[PDB]
Recover the amino acids of this structure.
């Protein structure tokens, strides 16, 4: 009777806003521990927080906080002022008869706040070829749904946010290529911003 | 320092015996063996305490055996291996004085057991130079890297600016694309971006290299095809700065 349920499998949060990741558990032994583990894309498991059963509900104003309802057997994880480094998979875990029982995880994605959107579709060309081409959709707002391809010979990657680490700059980016295809027609199955820049 | 696992990647043919090895943290006395997939999650397989197994109920009925010959070494053998064995296998360790002790996780081994090695290909790496429209319009320069046509999905992409590895301004796809979206054999593609300022790209004394570490066949494996044997290798593409 040692379970860990993380029902919401995917979560989103706006950068600098607060998200709460849910967890409910069932146990038998009245002396247990509760954990939160972070797993970045590296697949490394890092312990975020750790609570003891018969101890208080903390009066803590840290960025990663816990809501411990022992009577409700709930164990929330709150993340304030979210950052793009927080985007990872989060596992809630129990510690009873079995030393560690994991929930099935929650993929948290942190949406970057793009305040200077310059939607544009650019054409790049190969360093050693400049005849095999790629089309770069970049600098669009974070609410833009870039969707996969329909042709069997055109490939469209999903959007990717990079952090230049200087000027607090961030930008979304999606790539498309096909040996056949033009950039002005690459992302026309995704809803493109009205002011998108086609040089 | 932390929990050490060997190997890190393994790509092998079915029927082979797979040996995973773990070294716990110095002084730790309990050692846990986990498995990860998308369907079953983090799965306990077996865990020791003072080199004695405590719970092995998670061990499959056949082909999985684990042992701890001394206090700083444990092994987990898959014999014979099967395609469904493919997962990320984790080793963890605690002090071993309490069931509630914090578990430290090693980096994990990504094991891919294939049906046969006929479909293994290394990636092709091309770097695409920044649009001059992007330089003109934003005063920034985005480089794009394409690692295409590799199988299986055991690739590590990295950008190396001026001989040293960079992490800032780099976004690589979290998941690759299937070139044939309707094939279990389908080779993969993967894209990356390195955005620097127009000033940095236009300096012809800056060197950009997209490096893709591929994990494939080993020395023991064999090849009966007249194409290059897809061994573990590093395929690179590079570009020099261009003022105009």
């Amino acid at each position: 009777a040692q379970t860990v349920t993380q029902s919401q499998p995917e979560m989103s949060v706006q950068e600098a806003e607060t998200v709460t990741l849910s967890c409910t558990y069932d146990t038998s032994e009245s002396d247990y521990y509760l954990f939160w583990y972070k797993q970045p894309p590296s697949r490394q498991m890092i312990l975020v927080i750790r609570q003891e059963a018969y101890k208080q509900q903390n009066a803590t104003e840290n960025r990663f906080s816990v809501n411990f309802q022992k009577a409700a057997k709930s164990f929330s994880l709150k993340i304030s002022d979210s950052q793009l480094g927080d985007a990872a998979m989060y596992f809630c875990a129990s510690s009873g008869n079995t030393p560690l029982v994991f929930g099935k995880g929650t993929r948290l994605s942190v949406i970057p706040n793009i305040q200077n959107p310059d939607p544009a579709v650019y054409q790049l060309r190969d360093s050693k070829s400049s005849d095999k081409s790629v089309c770069l959709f970049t600098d669009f707002d974070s609410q833009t749904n870039v969707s996969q391809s329909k042709d069997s010979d055109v490939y469209i990657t999903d959007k990717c946010v990079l952090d230049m680490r200087s000027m607090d700059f961030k930008s979304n980016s999606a790539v498309a290529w096909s040996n056949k295809f033009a950039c002005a027609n690459a992302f026309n199955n995704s809803i493109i911003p009205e002011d998108t820049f086609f040089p | 320092a932390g929990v050490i696992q060997s190997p890190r990647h393994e790509v092998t043919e079915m029927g082979q015996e797979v040996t995973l090895r773990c070294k716990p943290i110095s002084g730790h006395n309990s050692l846990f063996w986990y498995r990860q997939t998308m369907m079953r999650g983090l799965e306990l397989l077996i865990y020791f305490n003072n080199n004695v197994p405590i719970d092995d109920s998670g061990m499959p009925e056949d082909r999985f055996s684990a042992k701890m010959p001394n206090a700083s070494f444990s092994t987990l053998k898959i014999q014979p291996s099967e395609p469904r064995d493919s997962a990320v296998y984790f080793c963890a360790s605690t002090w071993g004085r309490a069931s509630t002790d914090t578990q430290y996780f090693g980096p994990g081994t990504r094991l891919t057991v294939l049906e046969d090695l006929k479909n293994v290909f290394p990636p092709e790496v091309a770097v695409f130079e920044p649009s001059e429209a992007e330089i003109s319009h934003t005063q920034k320069a985005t480089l794009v890297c394409l690692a295409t046509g590799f199988y299986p999905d055991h690739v590590e992409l990295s950008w190396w600016v001026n001989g040293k590895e960079v992490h800032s301004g780099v976004c690589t796809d979290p998941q690759p694309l299937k070139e044939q979206p309707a094939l279990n054999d389908s080779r993969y593609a993967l894209s990356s971006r390195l955005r620097v300022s127009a000033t940095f790209w236009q300096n012809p004394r800056n060197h950009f290299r997209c490096q893709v570490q591929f994990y494939g066949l080993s020395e023991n494996d064999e090849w009966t095809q007249d194409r290059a044997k897809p061994v573990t290798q590093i395929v690179s593409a590079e570009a020099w700065g261009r003022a105009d």
About this structure: The first strand of chain A starts at residue 3 and ends at 5. Chain A is about 0% helix and 40% strand. Chain A touches chain B through 59 residues (CB under 8 Å).
